[PDB]
């Protein structure tokens, strides 16, 4: 089993709408949800960080505490499971800065994930999004060996991404379409 | 004439608010809607949840946190300056007796006649799961025409969520 990030309806849409708003600037925000299995990360919600490029310095500790404090008053009390950021027109990949930013997220929680969206490429009719973690310290699968090596090469690897919707969201989605 | 355009994200957020607060049979959730009222068609593109309690036995008793509106709205402005506070939402299923009074309070946060969207989170229903209202003297609620609109980015999102 592959490690998989399950993205909720509202998390996907809020990331797409924020990233598209920020174009041509890179934007970022935090991801809320839970870690489950070794192989499961659930992203239930996200929220935007104000603009200031994207780095640890863009993470506004007071904005974040105040957001989490208010969210908790309205029944949203999930921990931060990582962060997302757009890059408009470049693929989904981490630069050296993103890796440092992720290192810092990882220090807090070894399981944190980095989500990268490209909102410009998404309007081709396909959502371009991926998730990543860093990789720290007879029968095989050839393709997975090939990915552990390209991963080792660049210091991070990608996770599978899936979308979760409840049966009531599905019904609502089908009337919004 | 007067039309309302609603982004999909808005209806999914109200449903996620209703469900995450374990909102009881007969009870409701309430929040704020943001967008652009500066045209003949009011565009609703965002929302946030409010702490709200009312008395099941006594429709004239209810509490809405005023500090939370100002404090959340000031955080929304830091993300999107053009996304104004334009009205409010509740999960219904129908208009309540206190709604005109509540609507009055929201006048102090909007620069338009506040829009009330009633979101059907019970799915008991054949099409668009939100009805829009505006208070007028002609005081009473006027039902408005409403339709779905979101920017290209969200529309691809929705299709990806169904196809996936």
């Amino acid at each position, epitope marked *: *089993t592959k490690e998989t990030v*399950y993205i909720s309806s509202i998390a996907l849409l809020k990331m797409l709408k924020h990233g598209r708003a920020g174009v041509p600037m890179e934007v970022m925000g935090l991801m809320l949800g*839970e870690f*489950v*299995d070794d*192989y*499961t990360v*659930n992203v*239930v919600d996200v929220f935007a960080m104000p603009q200031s490029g994207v780095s640890v310095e863009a993470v506004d500790d007071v904005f974040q505490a105040k957001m989490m404090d208010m969210l908790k008053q309205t029944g949203r009390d999930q921990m931060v499971v990582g962060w997302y950021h757009s890059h408009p027109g470049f693929g989904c990949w981490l630069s050296s800065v993103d890796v440092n930013t992720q290192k810092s997220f990882e220090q807090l929680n070894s399981r944190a994930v980095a989500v990268v969206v490209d909102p410009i490429q998404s309007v081709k009719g396909k959502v371009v999004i991926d998730a990543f973690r860093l990789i720290d310290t007879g029968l095989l699968n050839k393709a997975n060996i090939q990915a552990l090596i390209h991963g080792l090469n660049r210091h991070y690897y990608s996770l599978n991404i899936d979308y*979760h*919707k*409840t*049966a*009531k969201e599905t019904k609502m989605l089908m009337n919004l379409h | 004439h007067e039309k309302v355009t609603i982004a999909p994200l808005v209806l999914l957020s109200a449903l996620d608010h209703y*469900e*995450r607060t*374990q909102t009881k049979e007969n009870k409701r959730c309430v929040g704020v809607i943001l967008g652009d009222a500066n045209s003949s068609t009011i565009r609703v593109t965002n929302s946030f949840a409010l702490p709200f309690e009312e008395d099941e036995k006594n429709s004239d008793v209810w509490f809405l946190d005023h500090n939370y509106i100002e404090n959340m709205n000031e955080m929304c402005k830091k993300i999107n300056a053009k996304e104004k506070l334009i009205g409010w939402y509740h999960s219904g299923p129908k208009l309540r007796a206190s709604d005109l009074k509540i609507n009055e309070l929201f006048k102090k946060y909007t620069q338009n006649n506040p829009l009330l969207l009633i979101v059907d989170v019970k799915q008991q229903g054949v099409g668009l799961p939100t009805d829009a209202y505006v208070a007028i003297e002609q005081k009473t609620f006027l039902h408005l025409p409403c339709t779905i609109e979101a920017e290209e980015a969200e529309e691809i999102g929705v299709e990806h969520l169904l196809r996936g």
Partner: nanobody
Amino acid sequence: VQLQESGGGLVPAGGSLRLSCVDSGRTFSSTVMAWFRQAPGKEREFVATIRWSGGNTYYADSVKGRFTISRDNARNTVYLQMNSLKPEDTAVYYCAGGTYYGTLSYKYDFWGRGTQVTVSS
């Protein structure tokens, strides 16, 4: 109603019970099943969860080493084997289905009516 739990009742402290849940599967799909429990005056609390296929499981801290969740795929049944029961384990127990692999109750799609478990004090 699509799910229907059984097993459960009164048992002394230190005792054992096996809960079961049958899914008719005539309205709702599910790739995940879970147990939850609700004590009088308390929030519904996640107990355990399992995927129909593969059968990967995950448990609440207070229940690890004592409770086992398992499933009979072909018979569409989930089981909770509860060993070393304590008074604090007393609650109505609910099986729940949906597509979400995790602990949040409002991510689940449908519920049984519940079965009462009472562990003598």
